[PDB]
Ligand binder design. Structure first.
Ligand code: ALF
Ligand SMILES: [Mg+2]
Length: 728
């Protein structure tokens, strides 16, 4: 892609260098120049020779890549802008050279009129437009490198066995590791290869596949996923899949396949030129033939509207030459130069607006593509709901203040590393003055079982004796019975997908605390607005079906897909696309990266993983869900403006075609030399300024979206929503 930009820039610069003198010379000639009209030889004038040299240099240098691209397009059996420019400029230059040569041969008193100015202007403007287009198209795709970065570079190979014979611990590159070997994973170290845990117990973070941050208990006989983050101890892994067979390698393969699947999109300029080229050829040929017929039938019109009859040449020569001149004048006038600037400029401007609005759009494709979206897929964790777990409700199970118990639990749970424990501690701190945690505290934890602590610093809490935190099994083994009402409340909490834990003091049940992810404030409104616009909303997630169903009910999404693996997301996106719907994937995780790449438009939350940002084409820096709606609206406006730009690129030149062909000659209007330049000034500017107008866009207020949905919005019922587990 770099070569295209470099060569287009070189062509544009050469066209500038060898055409700016051409344009300035023609402007000076139009303004008034006797010396310029002076002839070295009767056929050729000084001005004509200068124009010939300059245009020859421009076409030889500026037009080289134009010629190559036109030939390549012809190989594809397609007529595009390059073919139009090459054909028209070559015809004009050949005709100018031929007329100059024949005038020199005939030693005519006055040099003929030449069209040497046309090729330089067309080349300059078209090269500028295509260069801007290629600047816009260029994008950086580092998702593959980010995925490779996840994989562990080195692994700890073990020798002999883990029971009673062990000799050495050595370090081997991950690639050299082979199946059947036993490796060691230290706490906080990456999992090198897929395998089974042997003689080790720990906790592994597996956000690569499932996407959630909740730690996963790993015990002997369990399976580990390469790239998962180990902690809580040292583990030994017996390899089962290595290298490409690893799940991370499969995700990389899916991402690269999705990236390669995307095909180039034909620009509207090429589509317009495809029709224009036959049209321009047809009108030129019609003008030539009709002018020849007019000259032959009467020949009085030719004399009246042209001075070439004064020449000593034969009348047939006069009519043929004037017909050719008029046809080629129509050909020159018809060609639009501003066409290349129609789509690119606006695109860039739109991108800038997005940058001002907190939406980072990479390339021009997302802006041209978002308005066609008919379905949007939302991830659950991070996208629809905050990833961090937060406390929802605390209940009291002799009658001591709730804030005191919360402070006591926070002191007991201060050293807890589990996300739920730290969430409980932060909630307690927020509720309390939280000037400082209790100095005196004794802590003991049995993993997956519960925590027992001794706190004798309740005086510190009051200024601002045993604590036990546990689940059902903790109470059952300790002998504490569970009441029917507390059991029902805990079961209701479990049904909603919110984890509940119980606090007891001095062997007596005291309270219960529930923790769950909180749906974003704008999630419900964004979903409702998307549904109102006619875009289907699908909630696809790898989290447990209960929590996914609860979140969908909260945010009012009818279709729920739970326990979805990364490949299943891509499969769903592919199916939706095959349904002729255009799918936008909103994800902020590694598992979502292949879906984002395959999805027509990938929107990545600003706080998402780096790979998710790289794979996605649109990034929400302001991490606001409603922006997804706004991103659509902007796209709409952009495309509309683009279409309008094309009108400004064509209308003026079209108005010239009737004049160039002599339609208005009886009225007394004939094409003038300045017109050919003037339209180009009128068209190109009329395009660029129009694109600049896109800067006036302002985001609609969220209050407007809520007002449009003030009464239409209504919460869903749990029974209505449907839940699907996996692709099968
Ligand atoms: F946050 Al997910 F699958 F639930 F990427
Ligand atoms: Mg996520």
């Amino acid at each position: 892609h770099k070569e295209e930009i470099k060569q287009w820039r070189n062509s544009f610069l050469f066209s500038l260098l060898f055409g700016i003198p051409v344009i300035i010379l023609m402007i000076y000639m139009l303004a008034a120049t006797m010396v310029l009209d002076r002839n070295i030889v009767p056929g050729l004038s000084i001005i004509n020779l200068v124009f010939f040299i300059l245009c020859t240099f421009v076409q030889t240098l500026g037009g080289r890549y134009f010629y190559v691209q036109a030939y390549k397009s012809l190989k594809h059996k397609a007529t595009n802008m390059d073919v139009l420019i090459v054909l028209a400029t070559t015809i004009a230059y050949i005709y100018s050279v031929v007329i100059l040569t024949v005038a020199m041969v005939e030693k005519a008193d006055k040099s003929p009129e030449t069209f040497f100015d046309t090729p330089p202007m067309l080349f300059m403007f078209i090269a500028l437009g295509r260069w801007l287009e290629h600047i816009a198209k260029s994008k950086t795709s580092e998702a593959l490198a980010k995925l490779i970065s996840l994989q562990a570079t080195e692994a700890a190979v073990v020798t002999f066995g883990a029971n009673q014979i062990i000799l050495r611990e050595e370090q081997v590159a991950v690639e050299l590791v082979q199946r059947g070997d036993i490796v060691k994973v230290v706490p906080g170290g990456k999992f090198p290869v897929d395998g089974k845990v042997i003689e080790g117990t720990s906790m592994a973070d597996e956000s690569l596949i499932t996407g959630e941050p909740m730690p996963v208990r790993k015990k002997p006989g369990s399976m580990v996923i390469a790239g998962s983050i180990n902690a809580h101890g040292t583990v030994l892994v017996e390899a089962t899949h290595v290298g490409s067979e690893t799940t991370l390698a499969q995700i990389v393969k899916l991402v690269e396949e999705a990236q390669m699947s995307k095909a180039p999109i034909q620009q509207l300029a090429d589509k317009i030129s495809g029709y224009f080229v036959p049209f321009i050829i047809i009108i030129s040929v019609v003008t030539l033939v009709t002018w020849i017929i007019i000259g032959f039938v009467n020949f009085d019109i030719i004399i009246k509207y042209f001075p070439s009859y004064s020449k000593n040449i034969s009348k047939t020569e006069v009519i043929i030459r004037v017909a050719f001149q008029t046809s080629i004048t129509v050909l020159s006038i018809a060609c639009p130069c501003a066409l290349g600037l129609a789509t690119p400029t606006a695109v860039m401007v739109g991108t800038g607006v997005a940058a001002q609005n907190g939406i980072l759009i990479k390339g021009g494709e997302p802006l041209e593509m978002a308005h066609k979206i008919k379905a949007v897929m939302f991830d659950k964790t991070g996208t629809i709901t905050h990833g961090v777990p937060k406390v929802m409700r605390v209940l009291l199970l002799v009658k001591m203040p709730l804030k005191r118990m919360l402070a006591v639990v926070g002191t007991a749970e201060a050293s807890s590393e589990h996300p739920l424990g730290m969430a409980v501690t932060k909630y307690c701190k927020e509720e309390l003055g939280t000037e400082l945690l209790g100095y005196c505290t004794d802590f003991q934890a049995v993993p997956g079982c519960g925590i027992s602590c001794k706190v004798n610093n309740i005086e510190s809490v009051l200024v601002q004796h045993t604590v036990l935190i546990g689940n059902r099994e903790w109470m059952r083994r300790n002998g504490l019975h569970i009441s029917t009402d507390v059991d029902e409340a805990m079961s209701s909490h479990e049904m909603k997908g919110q984890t509940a834990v119980l606090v007891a003091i001095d062997g007596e049940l005291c309270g219960m605390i529930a923790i769950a992810d909180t749906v974003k404030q704008e999630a419900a409104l964004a979903v409702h607005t998307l549904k109102s616009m006619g875009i289907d909303v699908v909630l696809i997630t790898g989290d447990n079906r209960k929590t996914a169903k609860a979140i969908a009910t909260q945010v009012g999404i009818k279709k729920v897909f739970a326990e979805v693996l990364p490949s299943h997301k891509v499969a769903k996106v592919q199916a939706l696309q095959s349904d002729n719907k255009r799918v936008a994937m909103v994800g902020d995780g590694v598992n979502d990266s292949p879906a984002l790449a395959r999805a027509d438009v990938g929107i990545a939350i600003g706080t998402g993983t780096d790979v998710a940002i790289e794979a996605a084409d649109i990034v929400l820096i302001r991490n606001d869900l409603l922006d997804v709606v706004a991103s659509i609206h902007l796209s709409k406006r952009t495309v509309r403006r683009i279409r309008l730009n094309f009108v400004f690129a064509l209308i003026y030149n079209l108005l010239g075609i009737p004049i160039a062909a002599g339609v208005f000659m009886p009225a007394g209007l004939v094409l003038q030399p300045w017109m050919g330049s003037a339209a180009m000034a009128a068209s190109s500017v009329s395009v660029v300024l129009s694109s600049l107008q896109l800067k006036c866009y302002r985001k609609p207020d969220s209050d407007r979206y809520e007002a449009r949905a003030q009464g239409h919005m209504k919460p869903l019922t749990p029974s209505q929503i449907s839940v699907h587990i996996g692709m099968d």
